[PDB]
C-alpha cells in the first residue's frame, strides 16, 4: 500500500490537513522547552514543518525531508514568509535517503512513523542513523494501535515501537502521548468510530506514544 497520493492531495487542499495545526505538536514543544533539542536538526517527514520553523527561530540549522513535493513547497513558503535563513527542505523518501552522513544532532519524527509501511521501518531507521552525528537524540511521536486500527495507518503498540527502535537507538523513554489535530465536524462518524478527545482552543487529540532515544 501507499499513501503518496493522499498526502499530496491533503497538502494541496484538494481546507487544510487536520495535523497541520500551525505550531509544533504540543508533546514535542514540551521537549524543546526542556532543552532536549540540540544542534543541527532533522525534521523527518516534516510536512508543513511547524517544528522546523520553531527550531530555526530559536537559532538551530534545520533540514526537513518529506516525500510530498506539496509539503516541501509549503514548508519553504512559510520559512520564506518568516525570513528564515536557517531552515531548508528537500523532497526525499525517509525510508531510503542519503547525502547527510553524520549530520544531525537531533532527529525528530513528528507522526511520520505510522505514515509508512511496516516493511519500510528498517530502511528508515538505517537512513536516519546514517544521518546522525555521534551522541544524537531521536524523538518519535506516533499513533497508538489501541487508538488507530489496522489499515492505511500503521500505528504501534508500545512493545512494537520498542522492538523496532531499540535495534538502532538507546531508548530513554516511551510514554503515552496525545497527537493533536483540528478535525472537521462529524469526523469519523456519528457515533464516532474512533476515540477523539475534545481539547481546548478548538483542537482534538488521539492516543499515541512519545519515544525519546539517543546514540551512545
Ligand atoms: N516514506 C516517506 N518519506 C518521507 N516522508 C514521508 C514518507 N511517508 C510519509 N511521509 C510524510 O509523513 C508526513 C506524515 S503527517 C505529519 C507531518 C508533520 N511532521 C507534522 O507533524 O505536521 C506527511 O507529510 C507525509 O507526506
Ligand atoms: C496521517 O494520518 N492522518 C490522517 C488523517 C488525519 O486527519 C490525521 C490527523 C492527525 C494526525 C494524523 C492524521
Ligand atoms: Na508513506
Ligand atoms: Na504525558
Swiss-Prot record:
Gene Ontology MF terms: methyltransferase activity
GO biological process: cellular response to iron ion starvation; methylation; response to hypoxia; response to salicylic acid
Short name of any one Pfam family annotated for the protein: Methyltransf_25
Compartment annotation: Cytoplasm
CDD domains listed in its UniProt record: AdoMet_MTases
Enzyme class label: transferase
Effect of residue 115 to A: 6.7-fold increase in catalytic efficiency with componud 14 as substrate
Physiological role: Involved in cellular response to chemical stress and may contribute to resistance toward antimicrobial natural compounds as well as drugs. Catalyzes the methylation and detoxification of the P.aeruginosa toxin 2-heptyl-1-hydroxy-4(1H)-quinolinone (HQNO) to 2-heptyl-1-methoxy-4(1H)-quinolinone (HMOQ). Can also methylate 3-bromo-2-heptyl-1-hydroxy-4(1H)-quinolinone, and shows much lower activity with 1-hydroxyquinolin-4(1H)-one, quercetin, 4-hydroxyquinolin-2(1H)-one (DHQ) and 4-hydroxyisoquinolin-1(2H)-one.
More about this protein: Is dispensable under in vitro conditions in both axenic and macrophage culture.
Name of the protein in question: 2-heptyl-1-hydroxyquinolin-4(1H)-one methyltransferase
Species: Mycobacterium tuberculosis (strain ATCC 25618 / H37Rv)
Gene name linked to the record: htm
Amino acid at each position: 500500500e501507499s499513501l503518496d497520493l493522499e498526502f499530496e492531495s491533503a497538502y494541496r487542499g484538494e481546507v487544510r490537513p487536520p495535523w497541520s495545526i500551525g505550531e509544533p505538536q504540543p508533546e514535542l514543544a514540551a521537549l524543546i522547552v526542556q532543552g532536549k533539542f540540540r544542534g543541527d536538526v532533522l525534521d523527518v517527514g516534516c510536512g508543513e514543518a511547524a517544528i522546523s520553523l520553531a527550531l530555526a527561530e530559536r537559532g538551530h540549522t534545520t533540514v526537513g525531508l518529506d516525500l510530498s513535493p506539496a509539503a516541501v513547497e509549503l514548508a519553504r513558503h512559510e520559512a520564506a514568509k518568516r525570513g528564515l535563513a536557517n531552515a531548508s527542505f528537500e523532497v526525499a523518501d525517509a525510508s531510503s535517503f542519503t547525502g547527510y552522513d553524520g549530520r544531525f544532532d537531533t532527529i525528530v519524527d513528528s507522526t511520520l512513523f505510522h505514515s509508512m509501511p511496516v516493511e519500510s521501518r528498517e530502511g528508515y531507521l538505517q537512513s536516519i542513523v546514517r544521518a546522525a552525528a555521534p551522541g544524537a537524540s531521536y524523538f518519535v511521536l506516533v499513533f497508538d494501535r489501541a487508538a488507530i486500527p489496522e489499515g492505511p495507518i500503521n500505528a504501534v503498540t508500545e512493545d512494537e515501537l520498542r522492538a523496532a527502535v531499540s535495534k538502532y537507538w538507546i531508548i530513554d523513554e516511551i510514554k503515552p502521548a496525545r497527537l493533536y489535530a483540528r478535525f472537521p465536524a462529524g469526523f469519523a462518524g456519528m457515533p464516532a468510530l474512533l476515540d477523539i478527545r475534545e481539547e481546548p482552543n478548538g483542537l482534538q487529540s488521539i492516543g499515541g506514544w512519545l519515544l525519546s532515544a539517543h546514540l551512545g
